[PDB]
Amino acid sequence: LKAGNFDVAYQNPDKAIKGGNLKVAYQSDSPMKAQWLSGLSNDATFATMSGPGGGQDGLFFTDSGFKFIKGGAADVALDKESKTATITLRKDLKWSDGSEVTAKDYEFTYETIANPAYGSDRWTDSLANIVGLSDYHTGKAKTISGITFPDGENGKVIKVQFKEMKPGMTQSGNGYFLETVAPYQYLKDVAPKDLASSPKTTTKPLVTGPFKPENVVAGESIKYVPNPYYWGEKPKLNSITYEVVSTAKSVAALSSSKYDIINGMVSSQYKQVKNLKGYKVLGQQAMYISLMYYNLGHYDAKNSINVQDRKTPLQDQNVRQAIGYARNVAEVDNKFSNGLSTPANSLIPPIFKQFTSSSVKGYEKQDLDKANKLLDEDGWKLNKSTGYREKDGKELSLVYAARVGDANAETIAQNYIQQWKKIGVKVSLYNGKLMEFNSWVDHMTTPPGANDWDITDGSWSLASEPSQQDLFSAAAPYNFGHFNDSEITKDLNDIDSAKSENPTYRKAAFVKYQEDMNKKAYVIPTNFMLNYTPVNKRVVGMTLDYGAMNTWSEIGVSS
């Protein structure tokens, strides 16, 4: 397996020993926040750090495209004719203290998120599709009617009843049902409003995974030891330590071999890591898309709809396409990215093999000729004196709300401005400078939207159900440019239709959607990304493969 020129796995030629201690770190300049309950946890650092303990007690295995498979802590089955998910817990799934994992423990997860008393921020409207749950959530019902237990609370089966099936329900991270358990018997006597701060969820939790946290140092570390009661295969290792390391201290740690594995390392550091003897640098395709938006209208909050009513040359498809073809993304990436940004052909990242295809053609290749032609034949005639094109007497001049963040943010934006000059388009930065992130979010997300930009950039970390509704639908607030297209609406609907319960059909729907978006060019896909992970050469069985379900059990060291 490769990801770009990166290997996904480190095939160590040396056998693992019995036992050993593995030293892992997460790169963060901010402290970890321990919270073992998924619903109550808001810290991304700690979520990752919880991996050896079961990842906040996730239940389902998946394939390498995040499609549910059988064989994890539990199984999930979907029955369309009855509108039901059936979650079947393993006969021998236990908590770390030996107690059984039961049907109640799954239901309890729902309570942690849905009952406001716990203070979760993790409710979503998707959950209102489960029967009874909105009513539980607003306090109208004392219980969640659509969640029933075929063999009772202390049984191993839960049935979840929906108002409508959704084809994304076969993908992990779909959000229509939840994927974790909480130890009801361990936590039942904790007042909901105290749950998040309790030892029992923070420093002294119960977990279901291969390791359990023997010690937790607030903000800093976990000491993992084997969890005797884990259902799967006994780990090779005796222990794992998992610590936060600052961005500034990371490279040093690798040089001294203080950590065998450092996760979360940033792209700008790669050139420093690449040459470290002692390490194998793995890579993997990220759940990420960056793109260019064009400003085409406004958002009507009251009526929850985007109206594509803005006066701008960008209303011309030819102009939208031309500004895309003019960019040199591939060139930019080759200069700056160290291989970790690669040109997107489409809006769905290639890690989603079941949802896209490299056959879809976008703006991944600069074509200045085509760009100049498109503009030519749309009446934007070059004004020889000025070096910029005009139509009906007005210059083709736009504002680019480029933003800070990327090590080479300033330089990249300048490159694009110059490319655009080449095709007779005059482009300037929003107020002559890059926008700060928080200013950019505000600018983009505040209804009804601003009229004082034309082009901007956005980037998303996608969930493992790569839903486009919330980014690009007519009703989405996050449709920053505010386009509204019947064909696009149709396409998006088809993707989430009953027909799309069939994977082949869904694939084709995703593909058509991607094609249509590139053609219409309301937005333009920019980059896909790779993540990297340095691994000490003594590590055995390490891999970034997203279908690898037992790495913490399999992983070892050769000495």
């Binding site: 990420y288 980037s459 998303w460 970390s461 969930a463 839903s467 919330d470 980014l471």
Partner: peptide, 5 residues
């Protein structure tokens, strides 16, 4: 769901 980033 997705997140800025």
């Amino acid at each position: 769901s997705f997140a800025n980033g």
